[PDB]
Write a protein that binds this ligand. Structure first.
Ligand SMILES: *[C@@H]1O[C@H](CO[C@@H]2O[C@@H](C)[C@@H](O)[C@@H](O)[C@@H]2O)[C@@H](O[C@@H]2O[C@H](CO)[C@@H](O)[C@H](O)[C@H]2NC(C)=O)[C@H](O)[C@H]1NC(C)=O
Ligand SMILES: *[C@@H]1O[C@H](CO[C@@H]2O[C@@H](C)[C@@H](O)[C@@H](O)[C@@H]2O)[C@@H](O[C@@H]2O[C@H](CO)[C@@H](O)[C@H](O)[C@H]2NC(C)=O)[C@H](O)[C@H]1NC(C)=O
Ligand code: 9A5
Ligand SMILES: *[C@@H]1O[C@H](CO[C@@H]2O[C@@H](C)[C@@H](O)[C@@H](O)[C@@H]2O)[C@@H](O)[C@H](O)[C@H]1NC(C)=O
Ligand code: NAG
Ligand code: NAG
Ligand code: NAG
Ligand code: CL
Length: 526
């Protein structure tokens, strides 16, 4: 129950899972608290301690704005932080099988949340099930979000940008130096993440300082070429300056802006983040990754196109209705509490909410490519088109594009399409297979019989869990024992992908082919 690390001893705690035992180490620090002079700077390495750190409960989540649109609604609040917010939040968690494994493959989770929110503490990121069932070691970390994590005055080490990514990297570094003490193999480390976590995983494939800190990668509903993933260095500074004026810290010694922003309280920074953007959307990434010349040496589009990334296997996928969840956070005529049958004029208004700085012609082009109905009568037409618009543009087509381009340099890639609508979900049915609702299947929660889950859902989760583990351990996400559909390699030409559902696993080709030719070739030019 006590492990000696390079910076001191840590005491864990024991969990009973499925008649077995998992050892959990919740809240190990991996950096100096980024307080005081350290706010906005890269994470600094931890100086030794001499006691026994008690890693027996989740640590503080990092400071962040909370979604307040559906108070008391679990569909919404399952995503909000479940620990104290604090700037003192650079901690990670380790779940190891009991008894201690000998050379276990390691999975490192990176949460999403638009780079503005999120925490490793969430119920759906609980790694105890993967530890128990597949005898892998699961690690997850908190990393700074919002402006405290990604404020950028480029070149300036007081606010260089990408701090949250450097938090993640330092945690990967911690696993390299320390996980062998826990029974893990530092040579078999698979990163996985969802949404902005998935976009983070992809940027680690680009970043030269992460090359040697992991083996393989899994990207769930996200990647760095998504339109929200990378902030330009011009608008990044425009946003840093708008934050400065909004807080009274406008100086012209740029370093004096930072010192001034450092004497503010977290809440004062958090409440002005929303207004640095001229027009925002429910997908807005106010403060996110930038080309800082340190973590990220060039525009990631160019690195992807010219083959400049870690050469390894990737596992990539998306959900059937990525876009629906965002419609109820602003689109007119939409509500989780009715069937959201919108009219043509409502759809048009929705495009302005989701594509605010886009030309009238650009929005006509979206409407023209998504409103040629097979049947003109059905009243769902517009409601469904706007969901597909937001999901294809923001998630599915970037994920596909990334996989094509990545596979063209010779590495095995596997693509999935998650289309299971969970039996007992609190969101209405019209929202479908929503963004983030594969995560619980990946983490094995449906394996807990004890629950809301059907038997079909238990079997689906058990299969996904085996596929993810085989991918981590062996680079190949097959389930070999139960006469399962083989998962073909995804290649630039044939573009095969595997569907994930409770009924029929199927091999299909060329997901969203018509829609993504629009988003990937026509729409970037408007
Ligand atoms: C860059 O920033 C300027 C200024 O941002 C404004 O002030 C901030 C404190 C904050 O409150 C923002 O929401 C404000 O917009 C932007 O210029 C403004 O543009 C909007 C309309 O596009 C409008 O508020 C004003 O006409 C402008 N204000 C000023 C002082 O010029 C600008 O659009 C931002 N983007 C770019 C690309 O430069
Ligand atoms: C679906 O619901 C929305 C609004 O939700 C509820 O109704 C409101 C009257 C209010 O009590 C909210 O707190 C509820 O959550 C409907 O959108 C509204 O439609 C009418 C149009 O005359 C009007 O009240 C508002 O302009 C609309 N609100 C918006 C656009 O945000 C919508 O009509 C409902 N759809 C169906 C099919 O019933
Ligand atoms: N400025 C953005 C920043 C942001 C916050 N969370 C985001 C998630 C994706 C993209 C961006 C964001 C913003 O605050 N938008 C307000 C609405 C975003 C949804 C809140 C976050 N919670 C969810 C999250 C996920 N799925 C959700 C699905 C549903 Cl149905 C409802 C909420 C989900 C999956 C990843 C983590 C957050
Ligand atoms: C660290 O933990 C030591 C042992 O605590 C044990 O585990 C917790 C979960 C409780 O069940 C406790 O009763 C157990 O004895 C403590 O003795 C020690 O004081 C702790 N150290 C600090 C700094 O808190
Ligand atoms: C763990 O596996 C690696 C190769 O993957 C090997 O080099 C290392 O010595 C192993 N360590 C053990 C078995 O303790
Ligand atoms: C003010 O700016 C100069 C550069 O012009 C910089 O060297 C100096 O450190 C700044 N002042 C303080 C107090 O840091
Ligand atoms: C394979 O099938 C058995 C039942 O025949 C089931 O109990 C087991 O969990 C399945 N394994 C996987 C990895 O799906
Ligand atoms: Cl909880």
């Amino acid at each position: 129950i006590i492990i000696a690390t390079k910076n001191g001893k840590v005491r864990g705690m024991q969990l009973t899972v499925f008649g077995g035992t998992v050892t959990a180490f919740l809240g190990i620090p991996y950096a100096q608290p980024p307080l005081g002079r350290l706010r906005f700077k890269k994470p600094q390495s931890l100086t030794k301690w001499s006691d026994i750190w008690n890693a027996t409960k989740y640590a503080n989540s990092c400071c962040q704005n909370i979604d307040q649109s559906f108070p008391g609604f679990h569909g919404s609040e399952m995503w909000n932080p479940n620990t104290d917010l604090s700037e003192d939040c650079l901690y990670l968690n380790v779940w190891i099988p009991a008894p201690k494994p000998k050379n276990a493959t390691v999975l490192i989770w990176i949460y999403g949340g638009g780079f503005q929110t999120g925490t490793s503490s969430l119920h759906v990121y609980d790694g105890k099930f993967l530890a128990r069932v597949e005898r892998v070691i699961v690690v997850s970390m908190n990393y700074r979000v919002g402006a405290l994590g990604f404020l950028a005055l480029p070149g300036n080490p007081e606010a260089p940008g990408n701090m949250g990514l450097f938090d993640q990297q330092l945690a990967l570094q911690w696993v390299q130096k320390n996980i062998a003490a826990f029974g893990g193999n530092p040579k078999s480390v698979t990163l996985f993440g969802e949404s902005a976590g998935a976009a983070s995983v992809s940027l680690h494939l680009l970043s030269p300082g992460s090359h040697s800190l992991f083996t393989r990668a899994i990207l769930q509903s996200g990647s760095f070429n998504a339109p929200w993933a990378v902030t330009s260095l011009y608008e990044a500074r425009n946003r840093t300056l708008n934050l400065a004026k909004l807080t009274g810290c406008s100086r012209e010694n740029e370093t004096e802006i930072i010192k001034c922003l450092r004497n503010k309280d977290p809440q004062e920074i958090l409440l002005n983040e929303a207004f640095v953007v001229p027009y925002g959307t429910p997908l807005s990434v106010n403060f996110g990754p930038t080309v800082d010349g340190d973590f990220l040496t060039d525009m990631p589009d160019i690195l992807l196109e010219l083959g400049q990334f870690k050469k390894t296997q990737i596992l990539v996928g998306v959900n059937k209705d990525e876009g629906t969840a965002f419609l109820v956070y602003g689109a007119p005529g939409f509500s989780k509490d009715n069937n959201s049958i919108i009219t043509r004029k409502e759809f048009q208004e929705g495009l302005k909410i989701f594509f605010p700085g886009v030309s009238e012609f650009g929005k006509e082009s979206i409407l023209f490519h998504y409103t040629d109905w097979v049947d003109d009568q059905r009243p769902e037409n517009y409601r469904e088109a706007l969901g597909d618009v937001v999901g294809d543009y923001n998630f599915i087509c970037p994920a596909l594009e990334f996989t094509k381009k990545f596979s063209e340099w010779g590495n095995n890639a596997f693509f999935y399409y998650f289309e299971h609508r969970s039996s007992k979900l609190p969101w209405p049915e019209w929202m479908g297979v929503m963004h983030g609702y594969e995560i619980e299947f990946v983490f094995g929660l449906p394996l807990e019989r004890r629950d809301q889950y059907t038997k079909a859902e238990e079997i689906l989760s058990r299969s996904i869990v085996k596929r993810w583990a085989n991918f981590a351990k062996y680079g190949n996400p097959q389930e070999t024992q139960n006469q399962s559909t083989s998962w073909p390699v995804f290649k630039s030409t044939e573009q095969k992908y595997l569907t994930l559902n409770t009924e029929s696993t199927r091999i299909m080709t060329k997901l969203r082919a018509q829609q993504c030719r629009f988003w990937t070739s026509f729409f970037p030019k408007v």
